């Protein structure tokens, strides 16, 4: 099949214009129907555009989409961006056979403030937790706009799938945004490899921070 | 007592000749061409229907059975129809504006030996 | 107008049983298709299920097949989900479902935006379990810009939720206190993590107070900094 | 008292999915094709109707 590809998150100042699209990796979108569909975390999603572009009663003229032939994906063009724009947006369409294709989350979060860079903590083992046979390491990051950033587990030459999981950035108090990562590891696993590294990367820049075993727990 | 329907009914996407002292408006359901006209003797004219914000770009068209190309583009947030014109077979395609809207509507007439 | 209700919500015992359903009012439900997806966060909604006038013919999805069976009623205008143990990641809001396609012409609108509200379905099992506080100890490498950040670990622990409190609740300015999450091994972690001035550090202590309402449990926890300094 | 009419009227050419248990009937105005079938997935079907006395072409 042919996945729809989608930027995972994206923004501009309210009050103009803005755009998000859905690339199908292969196949055509212009062989059939495409529809998309805004969401909002309190109750449940509704939809915004159907058939490619054929926009429903009841939600304004602000929305619009459109097919882009050539390059393989439809996209949408929002004006006049509201206060309650902040959502999702997913988009689906059919494939070779009518089951679907869908596309990934795209979390619209359209905001204005001055720019500010995070700040990234890394944490080792703590004594009683290694005592309880737990090497797990805190990767802390905050102060960050926008509000997308990616988080990425290191082990120096071995890939590292197992024991990652990462929270969606939350706004605090202070109107910035705040997420951790934590990875799970034994007594074992920390014994083993020379280092551990984490990698933050936001708005397309990377920062890393790394960790060593020490003689004290 | 019967009374009139309110709209004289959603008709069918077909060819004929409408005669005169009548508006004939038309609603567009998919992209690209909504409707030509011509006496094939010294007027030929067609439009074209694009979605607001779309880049220039050439496209191309099943117009008259054989496919042609022209330019078209919008940037502004309503529907813009680019009508095409043509005084003779042998001629270049006179791409004349236009109409632009929001209510995804064209109207067309014969009056006065006019359209 | 049209509606979609459904019910069969709850805590479930992966390993469990239960049953799903959503029945429709407003249109045929003869001539349409019906389906399931899982929502859940962004990892994203999915299909799962397939049943469309039934010519003995239907489909299943990657991480469903056996577990879970599906059933169309014409009669009783619905679709019936029979659920039985599979994996703590269908902890998630069901959603049933069916765009239509076929062309209607001008002067009525035959469209729906065809969503039910859906119904929200975890996996957990939760015996009641103290938490486990575990140090996020700040150091040398950790400080920078003459701040500190040090904080507390409230791991395994059964049901929700939970309250933590840096200096008996003094000290609201700085502190970030996650939700929690499930993690696939079926425990709920969250962090806690405080700023403070880098002078202080060998003058004062810190203590975190974690308090766990089911339990009825309170503990109180102090970090004390370590030399290597910068 | 109303009656059917003689039969259901000449509807126009359109694209559309016919549920079951109901014939179409079509009669053709020009030549070559008159219709198709499909259903996108493992089904392609159309006609050309043909004037009769034609050549192989």
Not at chain 1, 65 to 91: P, V
Not at chain 3, 57 to 70: E, L
Not at chain 3, 131 to 138: D, E, K, N, R
Request: net charge neutral; glycine share 8%.
């Amino acid at each position: 099949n042919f996945m729809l590809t989608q930027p995972h998150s994206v923004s501009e100042s309210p009050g103009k214009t803005v755009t998000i699209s859905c690339t199908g990796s292969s196949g055509s979108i212009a062989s059939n129907y495409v529809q998309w569909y805004r969401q909002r975390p309190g109750s449940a999603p509704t939809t915004v555009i159907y058939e490619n572009y054929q926009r429903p009663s009841g939600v304004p003229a602000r929305f619009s989409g459109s097919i882009d032939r050539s390059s393989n994906s439809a996209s949408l063009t929002i004006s006049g961006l509201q206060t309650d724009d902040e959502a999702d947006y997913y988009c689906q369409s059919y494939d070779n056979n009518n089951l679907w294709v869908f596309g990934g989350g795209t979390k619209l979060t359209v905001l204005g403030q001055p720019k500010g860079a995070p700040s990234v903590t890394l944490f080792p083992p703590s004594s009683e937790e290694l005592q309880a046979n737990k090497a797990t390491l805190v990767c802390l990051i905050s102060d960050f706009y926008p509000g997308a950033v990616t988080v990425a587990w290191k082990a120096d030459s071995s890939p590292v799938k197992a024991g990652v999981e990462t929270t969606t950035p939350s706004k605090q108090s202070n109107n910035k945004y705040a997420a951790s990562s934590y990875l799970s590891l034994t007594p074992e696993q920390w014994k083993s490899h020379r280092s551990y590294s984490c990698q933050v990367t936001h708005e397309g820049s990377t920062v890393e921070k790394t960790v060593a075993p020490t003689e004290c727990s | 007592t019967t009374v009139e329907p309110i709209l004289d009914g959603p008709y069918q996407p077909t060819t004929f000749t409408p005669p005169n002292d009548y508006w004939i408006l038309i609603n567009s359901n998919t992209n690209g061409v909504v409707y030509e006209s011509t006496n094939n003797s010294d007027f030929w004219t067609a439009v074209v229907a694009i979605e607001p914000h779309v880049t220039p770009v050439d496209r191309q068209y099943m117009i008259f059975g054989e496919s042609k190309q022209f330019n078209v583009s919008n940037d502004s947030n309503k529907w813009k129809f680019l009508e095409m014109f043509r005084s003779s077979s042998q001629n270049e395609f006179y791409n004349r504006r236009t109409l632009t809207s929001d209510t995804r509507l064209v109207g067309i007439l014969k009056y006065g030996g006019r359209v | 107008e049209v509606q979609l209700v459904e019910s069969g919500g709850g805590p479930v015992q992966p390993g469990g049983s239960l049953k799903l359903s959503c029945a429709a009012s407003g249109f045929t439900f003869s001539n349409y298709e019906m389906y399931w997806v899982r929502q859940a966060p962004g990892k994203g909604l999915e299909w799962v299920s397939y049943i469309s006038t039934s010519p003995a013919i239907t489909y299943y999805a990657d991480s469903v097949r056996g577990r879970f069976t599906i059933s169309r009623d014409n009669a009783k205008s619905s679709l019936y989900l029979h659920m039985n143990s599979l994996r703590a990641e269908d902890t998630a809001v069901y959603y049933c479902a069916t765009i239509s396609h076929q062309q209607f012409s001008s002067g009525w609108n035959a469209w729906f935006d065809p969503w039910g509200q859906g119904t929200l379905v975890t996996v957990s099992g939760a015996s009641t379990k103290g938490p486990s506080v575990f140090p996020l100890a700040p150091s040398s490498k950790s400080t920078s810009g003459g701040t500190a950040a040090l904080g507390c670990l409230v791991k395994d622990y059964f049901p929700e939720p939970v309250t933590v409190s840096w200096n008996s609740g003094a000290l609201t300015s700085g502190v970030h206190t996650f939700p929690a999450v499930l993690q696939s091994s079926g425990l709920y972690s969250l962090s806690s993590v405080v700023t403070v001035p880098s002078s202080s550090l060998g003058t004062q202590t810190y203590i975190c107070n974690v308090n766990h309402k089911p339990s009825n449990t309170k503990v109180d926890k102090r970090v004390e900094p370590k030399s290597c300094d910068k």
